[PDB]
C-alpha cells in the first residue's frame, strides 16, 4: 500500500518514473484494489528528496503544491512517520487550516 501507482485501472502502465533520489507516497480511496469495477474519485500524494528539508504534497481537489519545510528531517524518506505526511484518509482536503502552507 501507499506507494506510487505502477498501473492504472484500464491495465495501462502509469508512464511516469520518479527522480534519482526522491521518495514518493501516494494514497487513494480504495487502496491497491485493482478490482476492475471500482472508482477512486480522489488521491493524496507527497514527495521529498531523501536529502531535502522539504516534503511537498497535493490532493485531488486542490490547486497549489503544499510544503512543510521542517529543517529537522534531512535524511528521511516519506515512508517515515516523523515527516507529517498526508496518509490514507484526509485524501481530498480541499482546505488547510494551520498545518501546511504555500500561500502568502
Amino acid at each position: 500500500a501507499g506507494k506510487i501507482p505502477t498501473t492504472t485501472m484500464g491495465g495501462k502502465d502509469f508512464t511516469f518514473k520518479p527522480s534519482t533520489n526522491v521518495s514518493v507516497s501516494y494514497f487513494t480511496t480504495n487502496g491497491a484494489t485493482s478490482t476492475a469495477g471500482t472508482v477512486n474519485t480522489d488521491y493524496a500524494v507527497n514527495t521529498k528528496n531523501s536529502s531535502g528539508n522539504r516534503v511537498f504534497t497535493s490532493t485531488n481537489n486542490t490547486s497549489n503544491i503544499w510544503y512543510i519545510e521542517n529543517d529537522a528531517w534531512k535524511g528521511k524518506a516519506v515512508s517515515d512517520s516523523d515527516v507529517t505526511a498526508l496518509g490514507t484518509g484526509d485524501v481530498g482536503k480541499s482546505d488547510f487550516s494551520g498545518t501546511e502552507w504555500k500561500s502568502q
Binding site: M9, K12, F14, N21, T28, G31, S34, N40, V45, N60
Partner: protein, 61 residues
Amino acid sequence: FTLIELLIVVAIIGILAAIAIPQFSAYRVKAYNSAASSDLRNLKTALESAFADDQTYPPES
C-alpha cells in the same frame, strides 16, 4: 632564497589558507527540494491524465 624571503612566503601561505570558505549547504538543499516539487507537479499530470481515461485515479502500488 634568503631567510627573509622564506618569511614572507610563510606569511602569505597563512593568508591564502583562510579566505572564508562559505557554507555550501543551503545552496545545494534548494536544488534537491526543487527536484521534488518539479517531480510532484509532473506526477499530477500523469494522475489527471489517467483519470480522464478510466474515470478513476489509479490503484496504489
